[PDB]
Amino acid sequence: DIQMTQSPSSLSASVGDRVTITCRASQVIRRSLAWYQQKPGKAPKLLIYAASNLASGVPSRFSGSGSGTDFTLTISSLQPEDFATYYCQQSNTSPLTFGQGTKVEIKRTVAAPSVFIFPPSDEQLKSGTASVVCLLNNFYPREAKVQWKVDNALQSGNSQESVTEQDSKDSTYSLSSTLTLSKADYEKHKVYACEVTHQGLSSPVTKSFNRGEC
Amino acid sequence: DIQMTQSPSSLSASVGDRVTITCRASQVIRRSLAWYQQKPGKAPKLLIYAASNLASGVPSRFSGSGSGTDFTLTISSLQPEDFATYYCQQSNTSPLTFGQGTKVEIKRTVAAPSVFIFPPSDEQLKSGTASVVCLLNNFYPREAKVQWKVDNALQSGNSQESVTEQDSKDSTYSLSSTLTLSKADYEKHKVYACEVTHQGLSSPVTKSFNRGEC
Amino acid sequence: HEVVKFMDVYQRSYCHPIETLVDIFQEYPDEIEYIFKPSCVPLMRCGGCCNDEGLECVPTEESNITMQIMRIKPHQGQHIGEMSFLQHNKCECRPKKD
Amino acid sequence: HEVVKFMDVYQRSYCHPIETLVDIFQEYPDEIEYIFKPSCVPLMRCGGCCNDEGLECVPTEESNITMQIMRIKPHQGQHIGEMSFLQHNKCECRPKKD
Amino acid sequence: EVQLVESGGGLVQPGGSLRLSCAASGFTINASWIHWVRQAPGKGLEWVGAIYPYSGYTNYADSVKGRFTISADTSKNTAYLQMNSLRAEDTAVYYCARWGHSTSPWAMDYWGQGTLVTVSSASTKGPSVFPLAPSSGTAALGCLVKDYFPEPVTVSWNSGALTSGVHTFPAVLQSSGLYSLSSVVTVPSSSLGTQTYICNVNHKPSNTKVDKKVEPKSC
Amino acid sequence: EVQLVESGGGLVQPGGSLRLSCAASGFTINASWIHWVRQAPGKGLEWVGAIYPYSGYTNYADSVKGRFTISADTSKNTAYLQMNSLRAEDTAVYYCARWGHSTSPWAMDYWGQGTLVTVSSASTKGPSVFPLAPSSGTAALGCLVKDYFPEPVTVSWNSGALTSGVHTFPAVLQSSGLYSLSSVVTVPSSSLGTQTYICNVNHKPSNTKVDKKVEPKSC
Beta carbons of C12 and A92 less than 8 Å apart: yes
Give yes or no for A66 touching E (CB within 8 A).
no
The C-alpha atoms of residue A8 and residue A104 are separated, in whole angstroms, by 9
Give yes or no for C76 touching D (CB within 8 A).
no
- Pairing label, strands E139-148, E179-187: antiparallel
Question: In degrees to the nearest 10, what's the CA dihedral of A24, A25, A28, A29?
Answer: -100
Q: What is the CA radius of gyration of chain C?
A: 18
Give yes or no for C4 touching A (CB within 8 A).
no
Q: What is the CA radius of gyration of chain E?
A: 21
Q: What is the CA radius of gyration of chain B?
A: 23
The set of chains that have 3 or more CB pairs under 8 A with C is A, D, E, F
Q: Where are the alpha helices (DSSP H) in chain F?
A: none
Q: Which residues pair with A79 in a beta bridge?
A: none
The single-letter code of the amino acid at B22 is T
Evaluate whether A10 touches A107 at the Cβ level (below 8 Å). no
CB atoms within 10 A of CB C55: 16
Same fold, A1-108 and A109-214: yes
Closest residue of E to A40, CA-based? E42
Please indicate the experimental technique that yielded this structure. X-ray
Q: Closest by alpha carbon to B87, among F45, C25, F207? A: F45
The C-alpha atoms of residue B33 and residue B4 are separated, in whole angstroms, by 10
Give the DSSP letter string of chain B.
---EEEE-SEEEEETT--EEEEEEESS-BTB-EEEEEE-TTS--EEEEETTTEEPTT--TTEEEEE-SSEEEEEESS--GGG-EEEEEEE-SSSS--B---EEEEEE---BPPEEEEEPPPHHHHHHTEEEEEEEEEEEBSS-EEEEEEETTEEP-SS--EEEPPPPTTT--EEEEEEEEEEHHHHHT--EEEEEEEETT-SS-EEEEEESS--
CB atoms within 10 A of CB A56: 10
Evaluate whether D45 touches D62 at the Cβ level (below 8 Å). no
What is the distance of C-alpha D20 from the center of its chain?
5
A127: which DSSP letter?
A: H
Distance from CA of D52 to the nearest CA of E (A): 40
The H or E element that residue A122 is part of is: helix A122-127
The C-alpha atoms of residue E118 and residue E101 are separated, in whole angstroms, by 34
Domains and CATH numbers, chain F: 1-121 (2.60.40.10), 122-219 (2.60.40.10)
The set of chains that have 3 or more CB pairs under 8 A with D is B, C, E, F
Cβ-based neighbours of F75, under 8 Å, separated by 6 or more: none
Give yes or no for D70 touching E (CB within 8 A).
yes
CB atoms within 10 A of CB B120: 23
Give the DSSP letter string of F1-18.
--EEEEE---EE-TT--E
- Phi, psi torsion values for F117, nearest 5 degrees: -95, 115
Distance from CA of C52 to the nearest CA of A (A): 21
Domains in chain B: boundaries: 1-108, 109-214
Q: Closest by alpha carbon to A66, among A31, A34, A101, A91? A: A31
Give yes or no for D97 touching F (CB within 8 A).
no
Give yes or no for A69 touching B (CB within 8 A).
yes
- A109-214 maps to which CATH number? 2.60.40.10
Beta carbons of B31 and D11 less than 8 Å apart: no
Cβ-based neighbours of F168, under 8 Å, separated by 6 or more: F155, F181, F182, F183, F184
Q: Closest by alpha carbon to A208, among A139, A150, A131? A: A150
CATH architecture of A1-108: Sandwich (2.60)
Q: What's the Cα-to-Cα distance from A129 to each of D2, E180, E217, rounded to whole Å? A: 76, 13, 18
The single-letter code of the amino acid at E177 is G
Residue F89: exposure state from Cβ atoms within 10 A (0-12, 13-18, ≥19): exposed
Of B49, B121, B214, the CB nearest to F130: B121
Phi-psi region of B61 (alpha: psi -120 to 50; beta: other; left: phi over 0): alpha
| CATH classification for the domain delimited by D1-98, as one of 3.30.70.1400, 3.40.190.150, 1.10.10.10, 2.10.90.10 | 2.10.90.10
Give yes or no for D5 touching B (CB within 8 A).
yes
Q: Inspect the structure and tell me whether chains F and E have 3 or more CB pairs less than 8 Å apart.
A: no
The three-class DSSP label of residue E29 is helix
Distance from CA of E55 to the nearest CA of D (A): 7
The C-alpha atoms of residue F207 and residue C41 are separated, in whole angstroms, by 53
Closest residue of F to C77, CA-based? F55
Strand order in the sheet with B191-198: B153-154, B144-150, B191-198, B205-210
Q: Where are the alpha helices (DSSP H) in chain E?
A: none
Beta carbons of B30 and D16 less than 8 Å apart: yes
Give which of F33, F51, F57 to mutate to test C binding, by max C Cβ within 10 Å. F57
Q: Closest by alpha carbon to D72, among E35, C52, E100, C93? A: C52
Give which of A39, A118, A160 to mutate to test E binding, by max E Cβ within 10 Å. A118
The C-alpha atoms of residue A75 and residue A60 are separated, in whole angstroms, by 9
Give yes or no for A28 touching C (CB within 8 A).
no
Cβ-based neighbours of B176, under 8 Å, separated by 6 or more: B133, B134, B135, B136, B161, B162, F169, F182, F184
Evaluate whether B151 touches B189 at the Cβ level (below 8 Å). yes
The C-alpha atoms of residue D24 and residue D21 are separated, in whole angstroms, by 9
Q: Closest by alpha carbon to A114, among A190, A194, A211? A: A194
Q: C39 to chain D: which residues are within 8 Å by CB?
A: 13, 49, 51
